Amino acid sequence: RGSFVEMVDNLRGKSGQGYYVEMTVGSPPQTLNILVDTGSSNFAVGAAPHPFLHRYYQRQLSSTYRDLRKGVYVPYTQGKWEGELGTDLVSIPHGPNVTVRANIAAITESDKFFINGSNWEGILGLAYAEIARPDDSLEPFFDSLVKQTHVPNLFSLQLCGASVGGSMIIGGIDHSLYTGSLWYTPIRREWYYEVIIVRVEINGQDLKMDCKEYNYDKSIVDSGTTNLRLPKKVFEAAVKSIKAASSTEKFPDGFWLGEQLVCWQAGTTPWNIFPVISLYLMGEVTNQSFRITILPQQYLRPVEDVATSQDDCYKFAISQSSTGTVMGAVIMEGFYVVFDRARKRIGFAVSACHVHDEFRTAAVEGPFVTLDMEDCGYN
Ligand SMILES: C[C@H]1SC(N)=N[C@](C)(c2cc(NC(=O)c3cc4c(cn3)OCCO4)ccc2F)[C@H]1F
């Protein structure tokens, strides 16, 4: 506990493409790069020669593969994948020295799922059984890992960003990955990693909305989403405030809606024109909260693949949502995040690797006095 040198820097990725960990499946071990995803609950891997894939799971080569004789069809809002369920032996080379028999969805058909040019071939769904497909009887990977081994029921994520890197500490916390203290928010319900936001500030200025709006219909912590996604009404108020605070320069309306990029000359991004964003999260104690604060370095994201521009272009990575608040990479890149499943709580601390400048730093601060925090949750 406390120090896990072998798991430090076990995450890789490229801008806009996610964070993946190396895993092995089957006997003899087949190496795959697997997207780390706290926003879903299936372990699902490419199993057929899709042209976008560097490699795929070849079940015929595994002596320990067991067929579950069941299919699964998983439609997303935009993409889809279809697979055949089975179990096999799974290990994480730069994780704990253990081997687990886990459920694997062998992906046999997909659409808009794999990314052309990405270096991952599967997704590790780290959330709970309640949102696993086809149903909650398909035990998620981490549940299998904890049941079958002596690995503690906790993992932590340091997502670094701006090619990317970071650490997934399985079964522990590594104190070198953060500064200051961890502050914990309760996991409201074990399905997604659901949390409650009690207050929102832009540059210290309160949005003054009914706090139910912040969590309509839920708020989640999701390593598998890029953006900070906010409920439509909250996004409207947030953008209005961000526009006002950033009034020194004017931008087209499309930029704020993520419909167009905005570009600047290299090394001349005016970060200081853009405001900080603070989310107050429900604390561990009645009437107690804490505040997490991100910078423009988190929410204005570089787009490097612009062939029609020589300048440095950025995507506004705060967007409107119909699925509630999503605390994606925009949030998580500022922080070391502890998914303390054993105690049904999520810890936040300032990330030792977060991108900042000489004037401002991402922050985790408390305690604050906040009343009626239970009323902020949507029912
Ligand atoms: C709808 C999503 S949300 C979801 N949570 N999981 C599913 C399993 C899903 C996710 C992804 N994610 C990414 O590609 C990606 C990219 C990032 C990034 C994070 N994630 O942060 C740094 C910048 O780039 C891709 C496919 C996919 F199916 C879906 F449920």
Side-chain angles (χ1 to χ4, degrees), residues 28-68 70-77:
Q30 298 173 41
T31 303
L32 305 170
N33 286 336
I34 306 293
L35 179 92
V36 175
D37 184 20
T38 65
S40 67
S41 304
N42 285 83
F43 184 39
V45 303
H50 196 286
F52 298 172
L53 293 180
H54 287 82
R55 49 206 174 169
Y56 51 97
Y57 182 31
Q58 290 183 293
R59 285 165 293 168
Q60 77 273 16
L61 300 176
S62 179
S63 57
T64 50
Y65 166 79
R66 295 180 197 165
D67 206 324
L68 284 164
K70 204 197 281 175
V72 63
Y73 188 95
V74 180
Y76 303 116
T77 180

Short mmCIF file of all heavy atoms in Angstrom, two decimals, residues 28-78, unseen atoms left out:
data_model
loop_
_atom_site.label_atom_id
_atom_site.label_comp_id
_atom_site.label_asym_id
_atom_site.label_seq_id
_atom_site.Cartn_x
_atom_site.Cartn_y
_atom_site.Cartn_z
N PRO A 28 -1.63 -19.57 -24.70
CA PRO A 28 -0.62 -18.60 -24.24
C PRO A 28 -1.15 -17.15 -24.33
O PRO A 28 -2.09 -16.90 -25.07
CB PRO A 28 0.54 -18.82 -25.21
CG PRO A 28 -0.10 -19.34 -26.45
CD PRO A 28 -1.21 -20.21 -25.97
N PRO A 29 -0.55 -16.21 -23.55
CA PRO A 29 -1.10 -14.84 -23.50
C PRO A 29 -1.09 -14.10 -24.84
O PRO A 29 -0.09 -14.10 -25.55
CB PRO A 29 -0.18 -14.14 -22.48
CG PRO A 29 1.07 -14.95 -22.47
CD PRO A 29 0.60 -16.36 -22.65
N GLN A 30 -2.23 -13.48 -25.17
CA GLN A 30 -2.32 -12.61 -26.34
C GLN A 30 -2.39 -11.16 -25.87
O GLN A 30 -3.30 -10.78 -25.15
CB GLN A 30 -3.56 -12.94 -27.18
CG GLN A 30 -3.59 -14.35 -27.77
CD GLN A 30 -4.92 -14.68 -28.44
OE1 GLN A 30 -5.50 -13.85 -29.13
NE2 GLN A 30 -5.39 -15.90 -28.24
N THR A 31 -1.41 -10.36 -26.30
CA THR A 31 -1.28 -8.96 -25.89
C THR A 31 -2.27 -8.06 -26.64
O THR A 31 -2.36 -8.10 -27.87
CB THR A 31 0.17 -8.48 -26.09
OG1 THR A 31 1.05 -9.33 -25.35
CG2 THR A 31 0.37 -7.03 -25.60
N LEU A 32 -3.01 -7.24 -25.89
CA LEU A 32 -3.93 -6.25 -26.44
C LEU A 32 -3.82 -4.93 -25.69
O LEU A 32 -3.55 -4.90 -24.48
CB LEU A 32 -5.38 -6.75 -26.40
CG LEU A 32 -5.81 -8.09 -27.03
CD1 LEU A 32 -7.24 -8.42 -26.61
CD2 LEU A 32 -5.70 -8.09 -28.55
N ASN A 33 -4.02 -3.83 -26.41
CA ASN A 33 -4.17 -2.51 -25.80
C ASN A 33 -5.64 -2.21 -25.58
O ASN A 33 -6.45 -2.34 -26.50
CB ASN A 33 -3.51 -1.43 -26.66
CG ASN A 33 -2.00 -1.46 -26.57
OD1 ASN A 33 -1.43 -1.95 -25.59
ND2 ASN A 33 -1.33 -0.92 -27.59
N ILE A 34 -5.98 -1.83 -24.35
CA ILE A 34 -7.37 -1.79 -23.91
C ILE A 34 -7.69 -0.45 -23.27
O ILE A 34 -7.07 -0.06 -22.27
CB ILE A 34 -7.68 -2.97 -22.94
CG1 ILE A 34 -7.31 -4.34 -23.56
CG2 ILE A 34 -9.13 -2.94 -22.48
CD1 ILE A 34 -8.14 -4.78 -24.76
N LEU A 35 -8.67 0.25 -23.85
CA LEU A 35 -9.13 1.56 -23.34
C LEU A 35 -9.69 1.45 -21.92
O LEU A 35 -10.55 0.61 -21.66
CB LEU A 35 -10.18 2.17 -24.28
CG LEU A 35 -10.75 3.54 -23.85
CD1 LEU A 35 -9.95 4.67 -24.46
CD2 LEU A 35 -12.21 3.66 -24.24
N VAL A 36 -9.20 2.31 -21.03
CA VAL A 36 -9.64 2.34 -19.63
C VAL A 36 -10.92 3.18 -19.52
O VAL A 36 -10.91 4.38 -19.80
CB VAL A 36 -8.51 2.84 -18.70
CG1 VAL A 36 -9.01 2.99 -17.28
CG2 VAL A 36 -7.32 1.88 -18.74
N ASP A 37 -12.01 2.54 -19.10
CA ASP A 37 -13.33 3.16 -19.19
C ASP A 37 -14.18 2.98 -17.93
O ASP A 37 -14.84 1.95 -17.75
CB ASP A 37 -14.05 2.63 -20.44
CG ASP A 37 -15.40 3.29 -20.69
OD1 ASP A 37 -15.66 4.40 -20.16
OD2 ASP A 37 -16.19 2.70 -21.43
N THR A 38 -14.19 4.01 -17.08
CA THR A 38 -15.02 4.00 -15.87
C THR A 38 -16.50 4.30 -16.15
O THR A 38 -17.32 4.27 -15.23
CB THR A 38 -14.48 4.96 -14.77
OG1 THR A 38 -14.55 6.32 -15.22
CG2 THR A 38 -13.03 4.62 -14.42
N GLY A 39 -16.84 4.55 -17.42
CA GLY A 39 -18.23 4.84 -17.82
C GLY A 39 -19.04 3.70 -18.42
O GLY A 39 -20.15 3.93 -18.91
N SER A 40 -18.49 2.49 -18.40
CA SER A 40 -19.21 1.30 -18.85
C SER A 40 -18.72 0.10 -18.04
O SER A 40 -17.80 0.24 -17.22
CB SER A 40 -19.00 1.08 -20.36
OG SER A 40 -17.65 0.75 -20.65
N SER A 41 -19.30 -1.08 -18.28
CA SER A 41 -19.06 -2.25 -17.42
C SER A 41 -18.77 -3.57 -18.14
O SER A 41 -18.74 -4.62 -17.49
CB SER A 41 -20.25 -2.44 -16.47
OG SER A 41 -20.48 -1.26 -15.72
N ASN A 42 -18.56 -3.52 -19.46
CA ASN A 42 -18.16 -4.72 -20.22
C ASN A 42 -16.68 -4.73 -20.54
O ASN A 42 -16.10 -3.68 -20.88
CB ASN A 42 -18.96 -4.84 -21.52
CG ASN A 42 -20.38 -5.31 -21.30
OD1 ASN A 42 -21.26 -4.51 -20.99
ND2 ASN A 42 -20.62 -6.61 -21.48
N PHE A 43 -16.08 -5.91 -20.44
CA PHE A 43 -14.78 -6.16 -21.03
C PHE A 43 -15.03 -6.74 -22.42
O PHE A 43 -15.44 -7.90 -22.57
CB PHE A 43 -13.94 -7.10 -20.16
CG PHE A 43 -12.54 -7.35 -20.68
CD1 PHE A 43 -11.78 -6.31 -21.25
CD2 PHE A 43 -11.95 -8.61 -20.56
CE1 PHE A 43 -10.49 -6.54 -21.72
CE2 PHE A 43 -10.66 -8.84 -21.02
CZ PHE A 43 -9.93 -7.81 -21.60
N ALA A 44 -14.79 -5.91 -23.44
CA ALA A 44 -15.13 -6.24 -24.82
C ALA A 44 -13.94 -5.95 -25.73
O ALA A 44 -13.41 -4.83 -25.72
CB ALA A 44 -16.34 -5.45 -25.27
N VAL A 45 -13.53 -6.96 -26.49
CA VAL A 45 -12.33 -6.87 -27.33
C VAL A 45 -12.61 -7.26 -28.78
O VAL A 45 -13.44 -8.14 -29.04
CB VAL A 45 -11.15 -7.73 -26.78
CG1 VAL A 45 -10.80 -7.35 -25.35
CG2 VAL A 45 -11.47 -9.22 -26.86
N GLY A 46 -11.92 -6.60 -29.71
CA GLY A 46 -11.92 -7.00 -31.11
C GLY A 46 -11.49 -8.45 -31.24
O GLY A 46 -10.51 -8.87 -30.62
N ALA A 47 -12.26 -9.22 -32.02
CA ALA A 47 -12.00 -10.66 -32.21
C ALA A 47 -11.99 -11.08 -33.69
O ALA A 47 -11.92 -12.27 -34.01
CB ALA A 47 -13.00 -11.49 -31.43
N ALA A 48 -12.05 -10.08 -34.57
CA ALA A 48 -12.11 -10.28 -36.01
C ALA A 48 -11.23 -9.22 -36.69
O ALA A 48 -11.01 -8.15 -36.11
CB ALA A 48 -13.55 -10.19 -36.49
N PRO A 49 -10.73 -9.52 -37.91
CA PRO A 49 -9.81 -8.59 -38.60
C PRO A 49 -10.47 -7.34 -39.21
O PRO A 49 -10.42 -7.13 -40.43
CB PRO A 49 -9.16 -9.47 -39.66
CG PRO A 49 -10.19 -10.51 -39.96
CD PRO A 49 -10.83 -10.80 -38.63
N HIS A 50 -11.06 -6.50 -38.36
CA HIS A 50 -11.42 -5.14 -38.74
C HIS A 50 -10.15 -4.42 -39.20
O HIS A 50 -9.12 -4.49 -38.51
CB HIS A 50 -12.06 -4.41 -37.56
CG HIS A 50 -12.81 -3.17 -37.95
ND1 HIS A 50 -12.18 -2.00 -38.32
CD2 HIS A 50 -14.14 -2.92 -38.02
CE1 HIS A 50 -13.08 -1.09 -38.61
NE2 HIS A 50 -14.28 -1.62 -38.44
N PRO A 51 -10.20 -3.74 -40.37
CA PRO A 51 -9.02 -3.05 -40.94
C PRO A 51 -8.36 -2.00 -40.02
O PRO A 51 -7.17 -1.73 -40.19
CB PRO A 51 -9.59 -2.36 -42.19
CG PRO A 51 -11.07 -2.33 -41.99
CD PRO A 51 -11.37 -3.60 -41.25
N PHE A 52 -9.12 -1.43 -39.08
CA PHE A 52 -8.61 -0.42 -38.15
C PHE A 52 -7.77 -1.01 -37.01
O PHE A 52 -7.13 -0.26 -36.27
CB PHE A 52 -9.74 0.42 -37.51
CG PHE A 52 -10.57 1.23 -38.48
CD1 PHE A 52 -11.73 1.88 -38.02
CD2 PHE A 52 -10.21 1.40 -39.83
CE1 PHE A 52 -12.52 2.64 -38.88
CE2 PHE A 52 -11.00 2.16 -40.69
CZ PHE A 52 -12.15 2.78 -40.21
N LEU A 53 -7.80 -2.34 -36.86
CA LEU A 53 -7.22 -2.99 -35.68
C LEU A 53 -5.78 -3.45 -35.91
O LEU A 53 -5.49 -4.12 -36.90
CB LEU A 53 -8.08 -4.19 -35.24
CG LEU A 53 -9.49 -3.92 -34.68
CD1 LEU A 53 -10.17 -5.22 -34.31
CD2 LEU A 53 -9.44 -2.97 -33.49
N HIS A 54 -4.90 -3.10 -34.97
CA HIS A 54 -3.52 -3.59 -34.96
C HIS A 54 -3.46 -5.09 -34.72
O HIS A 54 -2.58 -5.77 -35.23
CB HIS A 54 -2.69 -2.87 -33.89
CG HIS A 54 -2.36 -1.45 -34.24
ND1 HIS A 54 -3.25 -0.41 -34.05
CD2 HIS A 54 -1.24 -0.90 -34.77
CE1 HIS A 54 -2.68 0.72 -34.45
NE2 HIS A 54 -1.47 0.45 -34.88
N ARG A 55 -4.40 -5.57 -33.92
CA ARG A 55 -4.48 -6.97 -33.50
C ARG A 55 -5.86 -7.25 -32.93
O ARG A 55 -6.65 -6.32 -32.73
CB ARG A 55 -3.38 -7.31 -32.49
CG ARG A 55 -3.26 -6.34 -31.33
CD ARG A 55 -1.86 -6.34 -30.78
NE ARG A 55 -1.72 -5.30 -29.75
CZ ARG A 55 -0.67 -5.18 -28.94
NH1 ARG A 55 0.35 -6.04 -29.00
NH2 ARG A 55 -0.65 -4.20 -28.04
N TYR A 56 -6.15 -8.52 -32.68
CA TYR A 56 -7.45 -8.95 -32.18
C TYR A 56 -7.33 -10.28 -31.48
O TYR A 56 -6.36 -11.02 -31.69
CB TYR A 56 -8.50 -9.01 -33.31
CG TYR A 56 -8.08 -9.78 -34.54
CD1 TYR A 56 -8.47 -11.12 -34.71
CD2 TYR A 56 -7.30 -9.18 -35.54
CE1 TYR A 56 -8.09 -11.84 -35.84
CE2 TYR A 56 -6.91 -9.90 -36.67
CZ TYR A 56 -7.31 -11.23 -36.81
OH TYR A 56 -6.92 -11.94 -37.93
N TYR A 57 -8.31 -10.56 -30.63
CA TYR A 57 -8.40 -11.78 -29.85
C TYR A 57 -8.72 -12.95 -30.78
O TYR A 57 -9.71 -12.92 -31.50
CB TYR A 57 -9.50 -11.59 -28.80
CG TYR A 57 -9.78 -12.71 -27.82
CD1 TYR A 57 -8.77 -13.59 -27.38
CD2 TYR A 57 -11.06 -12.86 -27.29
CE1 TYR A 57 -9.05 -14.60 -26.46
CE2 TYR A 57 -11.35 -13.86 -26.37
CZ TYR A 57 -10.35 -14.72 -25.96
OH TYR A 57 -10.68 -15.70 -25.05
N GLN A 58 -7.85 -13.95 -30.76
CA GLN A 58 -8.01 -15.15 -31.59
C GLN A 58 -8.30 -16.34 -30.68
O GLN A 58 -7.39 -17.01 -30.19
CB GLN A 58 -6.76 -15.39 -32.45
CG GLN A 58 -6.59 -14.37 -33.57
CD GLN A 58 -5.39 -14.66 -34.45
OE1 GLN A 58 -4.25 -14.57 -34.01
NE2 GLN A 58 -5.65 -14.98 -35.71
N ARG A 59 -9.60 -16.56 -30.44
CA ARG A 59 -10.08 -17.55 -29.47
C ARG A 59 -9.57 -18.97 -29.76
O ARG A 59 -9.28 -19.72 -28.83
CB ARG A 59 -11.60 -17.53 -29.39
CG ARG A 59 -12.14 -16.33 -28.62
CD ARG A 59 -13.62 -16.10 -28.84
NE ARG A 59 -13.94 -15.71 -30.21
CZ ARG A 59 -15.17 -15.67 -30.72
NH1 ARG A 59 -16.22 -16.01 -29.97
NH2 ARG A 59 -15.36 -15.31 -31.98
N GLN A 60 -9.44 -19.30 -31.04
CA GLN A 60 -8.92 -20.61 -31.48
C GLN A 60 -7.50 -20.92 -30.96
O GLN A 60 -7.11 -22.09 -30.90
CB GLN A 60 -9.00 -20.74 -33.02
CG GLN A 60 -7.94 -19.97 -33.81
CD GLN A 60 -8.31 -18.53 -34.14
OE1 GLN A 60 -9.23 -17.94 -33.56
NE2 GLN A 60 -7.57 -17.94 -35.08
N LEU A 61 -6.74 -19.89 -30.60
CA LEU A 61 -5.36 -20.06 -30.11
C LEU A 61 -5.26 -20.23 -28.58
O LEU A 61 -4.17 -20.46 -28.05
CB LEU A 61 -4.45 -18.91 -30.58
CG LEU A 61 -4.24 -18.66 -32.08
CD1 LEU A 61 -3.39 -17.42 -32.29
CD2 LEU A 61 -3.60 -19.84 -32.80
N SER A 62 -6.39 -20.12 -27.89
CA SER A 62 -6.41 -20.15 -26.43
C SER A 62 -6.98 -21.46 -25.90
O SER A 62 -8.13 -21.81 -26.17
CB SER A 62 -7.19 -18.96 -25.87
OG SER A 62 -7.22 -19.01 -24.46
N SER A 63 -6.15 -22.18 -25.14
CA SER A 63 -6.54 -23.47 -24.54
C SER A 63 -7.48 -23.31 -23.35
O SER A 63 -8.17 -24.25 -22.98
CB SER A 63 -5.29 -24.26 -24.13
OG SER A 63 -4.49 -23.52 -23.22
N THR A 64 -7.51 -22.10 -22.78
CA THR A 64 -8.32 -21.82 -21.57
C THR A 64 -9.63 -21.09 -21.87
O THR A 64 -10.42 -20.82 -20.97
CB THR A 64 -7.50 -21.05 -20.51
OG1 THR A 64 -6.87 -19.92 -21.12
CG2 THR A 64 -6.43 -21.96 -19.89
N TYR A 65 -9.85 -20.77 -23.15
CA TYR A 65 -11.10 -20.17 -23.60
C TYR A 65 -12.30 -21.08 -23.34
O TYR A 65 -12.26 -22.28 -23.65
CB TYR A 65 -11.03 -19.78 -25.09
CG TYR A 65 -12.39 -19.46 -25.67
CD1 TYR A 65 -13.01 -18.22 -25.45
CD2 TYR A 65 -13.09 -20.42 -26.42
CE1 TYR A 65 -14.27 -17.94 -25.95
CE2 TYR A 65 -14.35 -20.15 -26.93
CZ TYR A 65 -14.93 -18.91 -26.70
OH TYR A 65 -16.17 -18.64 -27.21
N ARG A 66 -13.36 -20.50 -22.77
CA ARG A 66 -14.65 -21.18 -22.57
C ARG A 66 -15.79 -20.37 -23.18
O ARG A 66 -15.94 -19.18 -22.89
CB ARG A 66 -14.93 -21.40 -21.08
CG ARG A 66 -13.96 -22.34 -20.38
CD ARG A 66 -14.34 -22.47 -18.91
NE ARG A 66 -13.24 -23.02 -18.13
CZ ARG A 66 -13.15 -22.99 -16.80
NH1 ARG A 66 -14.11 -22.42 -16.07
NH2 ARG A 66 -12.10 -23.53 -16.20
N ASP A 67 -16.58 -21.03 -24.03
CA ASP A 67 -17.72 -20.43 -24.69
C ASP A 67 -18.92 -20.35 -23.74
O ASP A 67 -19.26 -21.33 -23.08
CB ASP A 67 -18.09 -21.25 -25.94
CG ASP A 67 -18.81 -20.43 -27.01
OD1 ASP A 67 -19.61 -19.53 -26.68
OD2 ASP A 67 -18.58 -20.70 -28.21
N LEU A 68 -19.55 -19.18 -23.68
CA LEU A 68 -20.78 -19.00 -22.89
C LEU A 68 -22.05 -19.19 -23.72
O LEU A 68 -23.17 -19.12 -23.18
CB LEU A 68 -20.78 -17.63 -22.18
CG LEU A 68 -19.91 -17.44 -20.93
CD1 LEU A 68 -19.75 -15.96 -20.62
CD2 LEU A 68 -20.47 -18.18 -19.72
N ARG A 69 -21.88 -19.45 -25.02
CA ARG A 69 -22.96 -19.71 -25.99
C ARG A 69 -24.08 -18.65 -25.95
O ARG A 69 -25.28 -18.97 -25.96
CB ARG A 69 -23.50 -21.14 -25.84
N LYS A 70 -23.67 -17.39 -25.88
CA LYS A 70 -24.58 -16.26 -25.78
C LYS A 70 -23.99 -15.06 -26.51
O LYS A 70 -22.79 -14.79 -26.41
CB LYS A 70 -24.85 -15.90 -24.32
CG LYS A 70 -26.17 -15.17 -24.07
CD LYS A 70 -26.22 -14.48 -22.71
CE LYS A 70 -26.51 -15.45 -21.57
NZ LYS A 70 -26.44 -14.78 -20.24
N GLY A 71 -24.85 -14.37 -27.25
CA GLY A 71 -24.47 -13.16 -27.96
C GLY A 71 -24.87 -11.92 -27.18
O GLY A 71 -25.65 -12.00 -26.23
N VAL A 72 -24.32 -10.78 -27.59
CA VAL A 72 -24.66 -9.48 -26.99
C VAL A 72 -24.56 -8.39 -28.06
O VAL A 72 -23.59 -8.34 -28.82
CB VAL A 72 -23.81 -9.19 -25.71
CG1 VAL A 72 -22.31 -9.09 -26.00
CG2 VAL A 72 -24.32 -7.97 -24.96
N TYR A 73 -25.60 -7.56 -28.14
CA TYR A 73 -25.66 -6.43 -29.06
C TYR A 73 -25.72 -5.15 -28.23
O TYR A 73 -26.61 -5.00 -27.39
CB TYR A 73 -26.88 -6.54 -29.98
CG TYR A 73 -26.93 -5.51 -31.10
CD1 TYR A 73 -26.44 -5.82 -32.38
CD2 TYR A 73 -27.49 -4.24 -30.90
CE1 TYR A 73 -26.49 -4.88 -33.41
CE2 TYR A 73 -27.54 -3.30 -31.92
CZ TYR A 73 -27.04 -3.63 -33.18
OH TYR A 73 -27.08 -2.70 -34.19
N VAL A 74 -24.76 -4.25 -28.46
CA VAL A 74 -24.58 -3.04 -27.65
C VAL A 74 -24.65 -1.80 -28.55
O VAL A 74 -23.65 -1.42 -29.16
CB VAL A 74 -23.27 -3.09 -26.81
CG1 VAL A 74 -23.08 -1.83 -25.96
CG2 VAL A 74 -23.26 -4.32 -25.90
N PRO A 75 -25.85 -1.18 -28.66
CA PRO A 75 -25.93 0.08 -29.38
C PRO A 75 -25.64 1.26 -28.46
O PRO A 75 -26.15 1.32 -27.34
CB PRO A 75 -27.39 0.11 -29.86
CG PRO A 75 -28.15 -0.75 -28.91
CD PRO A 75 -27.17 -1.68 -28.24
N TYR A 76 -24.80 2.18 -28.92
CA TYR A 76 -24.59 3.46 -28.25
C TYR A 76 -25.46 4.50 -28.95
O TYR A 76 -26.17 4.17 -29.91
CB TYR A 76 -23.11 3.86 -28.28
CG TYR A 76 -22.17 2.84 -27.66
CD1 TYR A 76 -21.21 2.19 -28.44
CD2 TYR A 76 -22.23 2.53 -26.29
CE1 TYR A 76 -20.34 1.26 -27.89
CE2 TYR A 76 -21.38 1.58 -25.73
CZ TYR A 76 -20.43 0.96 -26.53
OH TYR A 76 -19.58 0.04 -25.98
N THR A 77 -25.41 5.74 -28.47
CA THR A 77 -26.11 6.85 -29.13
C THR A 77 -25.63 7.07 -30.58
O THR A 77 -26.44 7.41 -31.45
CB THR A 77 -26.11 8.16 -28.29
OG1 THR A 77 -26.82 9.19 -28.99
CG2 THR A 77 -24.70 8.65 -27.96
N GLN A 78 -24.33 6.87 -30.81
CA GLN A 78 -23.74 7.00 -32.14
C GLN A 78 -23.23 5.66 -32.71
O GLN A 78 -23.57 5.30 -33.84
CB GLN A 78 -22.62 8.05 -32.14
#
